[PDB]
Amino acid sequence: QPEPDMITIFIGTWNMGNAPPPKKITSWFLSKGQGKTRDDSADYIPHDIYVIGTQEDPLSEKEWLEILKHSLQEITSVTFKTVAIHTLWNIRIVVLAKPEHENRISHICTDNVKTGIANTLGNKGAVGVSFMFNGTSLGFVNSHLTSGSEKKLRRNQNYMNILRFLALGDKKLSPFNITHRFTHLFWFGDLNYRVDLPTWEAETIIQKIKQQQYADLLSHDQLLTERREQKVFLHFEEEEITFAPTYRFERLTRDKYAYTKQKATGMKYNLPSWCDRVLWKSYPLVHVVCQSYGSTSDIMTSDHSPVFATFEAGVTSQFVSKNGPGTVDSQGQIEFLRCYATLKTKSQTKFYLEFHSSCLESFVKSQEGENEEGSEGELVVKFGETLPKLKPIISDPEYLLDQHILISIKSSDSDESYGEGCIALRLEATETQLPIYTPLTHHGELTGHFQGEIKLQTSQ
Ligand SMILES: Cc1ccc(OCC(=O)N2CCOCC2)c(C)c1
Known part of the structure; x- marks a missing residue:
């Protein structure tokens, strides 16, 4: 059945x-x-x-x-x-x-x-x-x-x-x-x-x-x-x-x-x-x-x-x-390219990302990003090509393309989240750099944006 x-x-x-x-x-x-x-x-x-x-x-x-x-x-x-x-x-x-x-x-x-x-x-x-x-x-x-x-x-x-x-x-x-x-x-x-x-x-x-x-x-x-x-x-x-x-x-x-x-x-x-x-x-x-x-x-x-x-x-x-x-499937990988967060915060802490998903064995913590000043008085946090490659538990595209990655941007000083969002893996293409985007919220109010590119490798 x-x-x-x-x-x-x-x-x-x-x-x-x-x-x-x-x-x-x-x-x-x-x-x-x-x-x-x-x-x-x-x-x-x-x-x-x-x-x-x-x-x-x-x-x-x-x-x-x-x-x-x-x-x-x-x-x-x-x-x-x-x-x-x-x-x-x-x-x-x-x-x-x-x-x-x-x-x-x-x-x-x-x-x-x-x-x-x-x-x-x-x-x-x-x-x-x-x-x-x-x-x-x-x-x-x-x-x-x-x-x-x-x-x-x-x-x-x-x-x-x-x-x-x-x-x-x-x-x-x-x-x-x-x-x-x-x-x-x-x-x-x-x-x-x-x-x-x-x-x-x-x-x-x-x-x-x-x-x-x-x-x-x-x-x-x-x-x-x-x-x-x-x-x-x-x-x-x-x-x-x-x-x-x-x-x-x-x-x-x-x-x-x-x-x-x-x-x-x-x-x-x-x-x-x-x-x-x-x-x-x-x-x-x-x-x-x-x-x-x-x-x-x-x-x-x-x-x-x-x-x-x-x-x-x-x-x-x-x-x-x-x-x-119970293990990873090395035929699967998720790469984040040229990513940056834009935050409404006045703070100047360094920030890191956490990636959470039931397609990972456990969540993944990035290195700190590079803070720059945005033109219109905002914080831009640049990750470039520094983000860890995520290793999904299953490589089958029938599984992986249905998954989602939750992203939190956290202060290095306080480990508190400044923004949460979600990226779908339901992509137009695999093995292809594709734009991604989520708004970021904290306590359900808008705090920023996360955008960049993704490259998804499946077993197909
Ligand atoms: C269809 C379905 C129904 C209940 C259930 O587990 C919870 C349970 O059995 N309870 C006893 C009665 O009160 C609520 C809690 C599961 C796993 C599936």
């Missing part, structure tokens, strides 16, 4: 509003309602992996798992296996997979981050899960960020705290945060970004939603505007939104948006907003295609509607050769 080169992944996010779910929630897992929806002809075809993020979840883990498994079994006639479940306060993540995937899944990690300080510590934060699916690493983050229309900068801070401190994936990738540790990273939840229009425009916004005219609302969505200004979720993707705002509804109908200030809201307005979102980041040139992104219309126990997103995701097999794993 062959190993897959593609799987499908369901991502769900639902802020349950502290209420139990209705008896039927199958529309969520079928990607039916508003937006980009799944074709009826696929209804019986199970996804490989289902990842369910809840916020304001009032259920026990047992209660919710029973509902989820019975829902999927009704749809698919498949009894899913529980990969992971992790809850922080009322924020929860569940990972279910087809039973045929049980021996494909390993290295399961869970973690949480609590955001805020004092007043603001005690109900917001994130839960996450990571694991290996054959040769592919998968990470999943469910975050419930700070609420309120005037707190977008707090949400951005919550995002940075979560990606700095959530401890998922391979701990040997010590310079790298979760935005570089996975082949595919999915980040979803009640991100709580609002449509930034005046309170006086509430009824106008409602009108627009009734007309399915979302363009003038999406142009004020705080998450889209913050992402365009590179304030949050740098280098993440989001499918186009074609569904109505998923917050704030009167419960037990979807006919009414409840936006007016009440004692129960702390006398805050809740204009209709896309609070409930799914974003992703995959390594360069890895197949990832969003096949649905929408909201349900028929689950009305909460003041939020559930959101679904589904993806085709490229995966690779657990490769064995006669040589690696």
